[model samples]
Target: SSMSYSWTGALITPCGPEEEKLPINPLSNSLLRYHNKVYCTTSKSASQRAKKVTFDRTQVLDAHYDSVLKDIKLAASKVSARLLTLQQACQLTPPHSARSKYGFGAKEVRSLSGRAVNHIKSVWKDLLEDPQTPIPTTIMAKNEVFCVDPAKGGKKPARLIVYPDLGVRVCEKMALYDITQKLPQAVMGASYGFQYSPAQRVEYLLKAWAEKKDPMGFSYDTRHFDSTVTERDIRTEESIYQACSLPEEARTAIHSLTERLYVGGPMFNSKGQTCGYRRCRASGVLTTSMGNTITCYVKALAACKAAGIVAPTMLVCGDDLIVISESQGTEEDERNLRAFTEAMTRYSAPPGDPPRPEYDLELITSCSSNVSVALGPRGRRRYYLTRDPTTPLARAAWETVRHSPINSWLGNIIQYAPTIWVRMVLMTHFFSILMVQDTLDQNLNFEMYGSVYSVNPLDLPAIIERLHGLDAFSMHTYSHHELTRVASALRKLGAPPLRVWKSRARAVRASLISRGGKAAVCGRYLFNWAVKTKLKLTPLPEARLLDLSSWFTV
Candidate 1:
């Protein structure tokens, strides 16, 4: 129980051929210069990661933790959740989810074919009957690609992914999808970070900052939160689920899953060798996001109370937490945060770096994003969400190798639509690619959360308007921090400087305008930030009717 993973000599094998690092393509080449710097994490690198993550984590829960647990369970009882039908759970599978050892994939599950359905049913029956058998999970090094970091010695190893077969994934959804949908919001309320849109997140933070008489903020960083989750912590998560109103079958299934799969499991490699055993959170489970968010919030809130931080308001997303509270002067705030760190460490969640108080709202970051100011309609100072453009640009550059299922560029353009870098650079580069390939009208798939949308380039203007509002188009006067970060990221990634993007955007803009119709709308609105002169932008009618319900689905 002390060890996170006890491994044999088996290598973490890839299920299929790994994607070639830095595929040679003209469009991809044009975006970034140092192609050699980008590399995918491999089986060789995984051994290093395994040593780092496999360790004994100790947790000492106190009265404060107990009190928080009581409150979470009490809050959970307020909502009633129903079990998902087998068909409904099958439909939730991502289209390209990995195939099972049983020769079934997401396609078979989604269609509810006879073979897949029968297997799923039998799996469910097994869960109900036997509550103590450990479910076997495949352990693989998640093939994460990244840019070389000089500060952190060069390349980092891939994180490990432990997952059950396809049938079990559907079973997870059937038992817990309802709870995942409802529990976090009910318990954490405004602190549940996923419930907020990027714009809304900015608004929430600003409002919280404004409300504090002497506002102080800091983001908590846990070294490895998933590993910190203990067997007791997992059972507590199960107890919270049991508190919810549920049918008898649902209750039994939940209990069985907690005993059999949720707490610990045998980890096998792709070669079907006994690689190790995982006694912590499984990264690939359906409950991963919800479980992490809830566990982190409980621990963080308890730590805040234990530290006696005044009027603390926390925004929690998975392992990420940022707390804004009334300061008792700089010295006192720093002392309280130190005490907060101690309390979190006691609870087995230690900081990667000790937190420091950030006086400025824009200085604090959580969930890899921060708040910044931009000029919106009529030159109003509007707060927007932004982050360092390095990763987005790196991902966008990689996407140009071939048309991929998940378009990171499109997702960035949509989510960070109001940011200067996203609008000026990402949109310009991608639209130019689409035009060159004459795929302007072709639908490109992008995911917001887990839901996928196939959208044509011509429709982006309306979509951006709908999601980020008309302010996304008219935004200007980006903050100094944001501008500097973008410039630095471009340089680091070997991307062409902002000026090149400006000129390229102009060319792309002209071509789009020549095409006319919706293409012209995108050219005018999206590239407005590039030009000295601006267009008289107005709200589009279609923007209002665009159903955004799917994008925000929990």
Candidate 2:
């Protein structure tokens, strides 16, 4: 088995006001007496999980590996055309959280800092002056919870991470960020399914499903994707930079950074005691996303072709891969998948959950999610990225206290509207909360994320239309089976029944159009699940034209 990244000892700290005891979310936060303690990422219980860190796997590449190096280099050059100069890269801001451990926040890093900028300049100078040393990172934990398996045994609390100092991270952007941003999409093209929105991913799944009469699909997950990355792999990654036609200095900086910073770093716990160090790709850091994904794809794609699992096309999003090819009959598909397993193990990569044929999307789960299908009001094929709704619900309760929530089904509901469960369960719950507050207008600000610096509500529809095409607002079908599955997932995950939700949604919609103010738009847009007319979207002159979609994380 490959290494599983156990979050060993991380705790989710309170991001909300420390004064409130957040109520129990029956879905995920119900108090669990695990050997006698209540736990969840909630303020109700906090605990630090600790465990030994090890990366004994050797990463040296074989003769077969050199071929990969050549391919990756060729791929990198295509995507990284005209690399950004340091000054231009520096123009882009690192997240506020990634700021200097020199105790400077984002604002200071952004401007002509009277003092901190000089200090940052000095750090950058030293980094260039000495190419072989690893830069130190500030270790801090933020409140995060995963609905998937706890990274550790019980609750993988939340992660504590080591990030390079502010100047170094900005340096990293100049050297690595552009390549990370563009490489996967460039190399994999349509195969890079991770670049698509959750809605788009579902649409692809359904389109493939409809096109192929006899289709068998399965999702493959690499046990612990980051932890499984080996030292040899890191060097091979370094070689990828060397192979590129990069500036000699740029190459040197990347190589040194790879060895010193990327390979491993010491991590400190809450008391500032040295708990352990990393030897594999870390969960934190921007490179982990690029490194782990490209590295994993490098190995897996090679194995697939070697084993002749010639599925017409394959899709990968980090570790979760979906193969939808014409069925070679059930048993034959199993044989092909096992051959793939053999090739994977030979390369020191192993799947904790190997491939299996699942006829229904709901049956396959990866990246802590499963696909649930339903039919929209127009009888269109609708797919939802669903899971144990506990996480979604917990976030909802937090929104409950707000004057209210909006456009915030933010998931399958908003993206794949007209779906029964989204219309019934999600839209119903979300709108009921918002309409009662009379502040739907106040909530139309924007959808911004951490990786997201600036964003707008207008940008999303444009991206969806650009990437997903006519499928976004067009596509119709009739299916009772799909909605039943959607309903089942709702109840299975502790959401109310579709019927009740439908009742709730209709009541809210009726009351929704009661006012002609901005609040009335809820019926036009947010409540489109039950309406025949959809809103005509207005524009953000600069935002939509800017194509800010790429600004957000995949």
Candidate 3:
């Protein structure tokens, strides 16, 4: 009865054409070798994901869990949320969201089309009137991608993406957006993960580590995180939101949505056949990030209490969590971490791998990256965020062949602006490719949180400076392990070696400087590391007014 999904043997179908292999365009070919290795997720592959995700879950909620829930309720009570106006929610719709079964898409919603507005209004009315009827959700395969690993035997499967109609999506935003924006930070405080940028995240982690007399940290990974969410867990999540001082209509709407959409629903495939019934977290909801964060935080806080880990400071982003706490001793840290895992497992949030204590801050990876030190500004140590470049390179290669609405390479460069690999490899390679294509000035979209913004490549210099600060351009002498991982990933993905990137970056820099203006600023700052003599870079005025306030919100 508590199975994540109950299946009916219907195949998950694709709505539009999907590219499986990276095309042999010279621009893409220049980025990576073994084009055949890079492939997109298919329906067959999605079936595999479906199989893996469908399983019964068991939970044991203890007093520790109850105590944490009480704390969460106390925190939640501090927030007084209001429902967003229907028009405001409509305007928040992403421009390219999938069309509804009723034939309206994000464009219609965003434009405030009469038909779309009326339909959305009707959906809202239904939500208010019917609290017990289960809403139907469409199940599609997420575009899980990979560079095939022969060593690992085969390709990874696509994740199942389940969401209700476009009208419902708008209604969801109207009902929950304000709460989603305010609740996590209110409840989790400094531990709320979405509030920090990469650099800030690193700074917080480092400070937390140093403040401890004997610090020990470890990252926790939950197996099939969304699936492990029980109906009771979902109700508990609703109760947490209910604790907030919401308006009567907003409260009623929240309760109705909780029962109808958030907790569980009937799943349908693109071919219109009944796919299954889902009795767990719907990964595509507006609440997915908020729900996962709050749920994960609750379980984590409970586990910490149950294990008696002292003075624990946690940073949780969705299901990715890393906790740094004062150590008892090496043996005790290990033992407590085991107890932590045991508690988490009992709470139905089992670890993908058993948690282990990490003494070195640099060695602990969370959100698929770690904090590493580099020499900056007269040899003072500067900490920056970094990750393995394989996936970004692979996706960048794919983006080159097909025109992506959002440039992920640019997004990586913006987010990981201070990283060695990003500054040297991604910036140089993408700029060069775009320069050669004579499209450097054209605007391309990139997403942050759930919002998409079209940005010109020329604006990157200012954006980078605004996000990462000027040290992004000055970071050098990266940690040996970070450098080693970057080089290894480059070789593994058949990307240009570091030295090649360096030479090519100099060329790109020279070309940009010759062109002048914002392009010149990019040249001077981004590729300064490639030159023997660097520019005396000053902060761009454009960087001052750029409001990145919306970028980090969950």
Candidate 4:
């Protein structure tokens, strides 16, 4: 018979500092042996104690880490400013301008240089110049002529002039005069119009005051405005006006308004349509009803979900659902489906009972054959199969046929019919494959992937010819995939090698897999029963635990 032990009799042993011996429980003889080895044994134990007693001095030094970071940032900024100045000067050089004849390049450089020079001048003048001396303003302008051919005979050139504001006084005065004089009578007739509004009148007065008293608003005279009409005051007035202008009904509706409305629409109704008291009564439309619309939407959503149609809560009128494969049926639809399915389950068979699982024979057979053939010797060689446990061809075929083609077909079917679905499915499959191939080819690092073979002294030219042939193949593949090959004297360039293609490809594939996995997971967890009975969609492989794990990691 096994002996019974009581935890109540257990004693706690405390370990102390390295210099001090730990207090051992006398009840346990093993504790004494442990302590003797740790603190009182030999010279080795003494050295170990000494080492443990020493504090880490580096820990205190780490407190200044933030200061070091700030210094680095300041140094980087200074270096960046100096480099910008140099780049500006280089761009202004005559040779640089000659190389870029379009004048757009010269103009950009000139603008940059002007800004740098102005900043430097401003800083220097502020530090060294007399405090009372007014700062000088530099204005740069460009004039271009637009030549128009006269309908009857001659040609005429029209000059366009652009000017920087002389001061706020000039801008305000102009704005006031334009509003008061140039605006049409209909526009200027309202209470908040050019003539009547106190804000407009005040703006004009302020402009006039600035012009006469403080040109640049740097002096004490301009500071007087600080004591009057604060930004807070203006904001409060504006808020009041907004609050008063809206009707009570609109104001009440604001309470029901949500972040979802701006992004898509309300989960239960169409956008720009209210949900409170005055909802429309049109059936099949997103017209709101008094009670929850869950029951009414259940049949429609169950039909769609059964067909593997991932209907998002907020779908736009014409947005392609095929592209957004992860979106499930609307929240309301899910709720109703859940209630309906539960009621049916009471009288129906248990979840895992006979005749429950309906496997698609055609789909399974096609997938197995395709995947097996894809993992053959040729496919393995092309994709370097040893890197992954699953063959590249198998994975690719499964991904293309199951996730890409099937989902795309289902989306089209829910929205359209079998004919349209087939056509669209083929098109999407073709385009997706082309995109994937292009991405892979462009990302293959030749230096890393290719074999480096030494050429014999006699066969150097032959090696060169072979290299040229390979380059031509690469160039031709790129050009054919990306460029339009219309007959002409001019030829279009091929697709360039992407700078960070490997990372990009990984990210894109990860996104696609993750999206598909999320949809499957949500359907499994949120609406498992409804998914089983009402939604007759084909379930993903339950044995593919590794696939689920991969998606989660991504």
Best model per lDDT: 3
Which should have the higher TM-score, number 1 or number 4? 1
Q: What stretches of model 2 exceed 4 Å from their correct place? A: 1-20, 23-55, 58-69, 79-91, 138-142, 146-160, 203-214, 359-388, 398-419, 443-495, 517-521, 524-554
Listed per candidate, the RMSD to the true structure in angstroms reads: 1.7, 5.8, 1.7, 38.9
lDDT per residue for candidate 2 within 1-554, as digits (tens), equals: 33323333544333334323235333222211121122234433333422323334544344444565567678766543344555555566643445555777566656646565567567656656786665554444445433333334655543445566667766677677666767777666777765666666676777877677787777777755666677667777776655556665667667767877887766554344553556667566667766767777778777666555545456777777777777778887788788767766666677877778777767767655666654544665556565544444434333223322233345434344434444456656655654455444443433433342332322333444443343433323424555656555554345566556656666777776676543454454445455456545443233345453543345
Indicate the residue-level lDDT of 329 in model 3.
Answer: 90
Per-residue C-alpha lDDT of model 4 across residues 292-329, encoded as one tens digit per residue: 11111222223234334332121111101000122233
Identify the runs in model 4 with alpha carbons over 4 angstroms from their true place: 1-254, 258-356, 359-554
lDDT of 4: 0.21
lDDT of 1 by residue, 1-554 (tens): 37777888788887767766445646777777877777767776778888888889788999998999999999999979999999999999989998878888999999999999999999999999998999999888877657788899899888888889999999999999999999999998998989887877888999899999999999987887778788888998999999899999999999988888889899998899999888889888888999899999999999998988899989998999999999989999889999999999999888988999989988898899999887764678888888877767766655433345237888898889988888778888889888888888988877877788887778888888887788888876778888899999889988888889889999999998899888888888888877778878889888888876567547
lDDT against the true structure, each candidate: 0.86, 0.56, 0.87, 0.21
Clashing residue pairs for model 3: none
lDDT of 2 at 501: 64
Cα displacement (Å) at residue 173, model 2: 0.9
RMSD of 3: 1.7
**For each candidate, what TM-score against the reference?**
0.97, 0.77, 0.96, 0.13
For candidate 2, what is the TM-score? 0.77
What's the best-to-worst order under TM-score? 1, 3, 2, 4
Which runs of model 1 end up more than 4 angstroms from their true locations?
A: 376-379, 399-406
Kindly indicate the candidate among 2 and 3 with the higher lDDT.
3
Candidate 2 lDDT for residue 361: 66
In model 2, residue pairs whose N, Cα or C atoms come closer than 3 Å (at least 3 residues apart or on different chains), thus clashing, are 8-49, 9-49, 59-232, 376-418, 379-477
Candidate 2's displacement at residue 266, Å, is 2.2
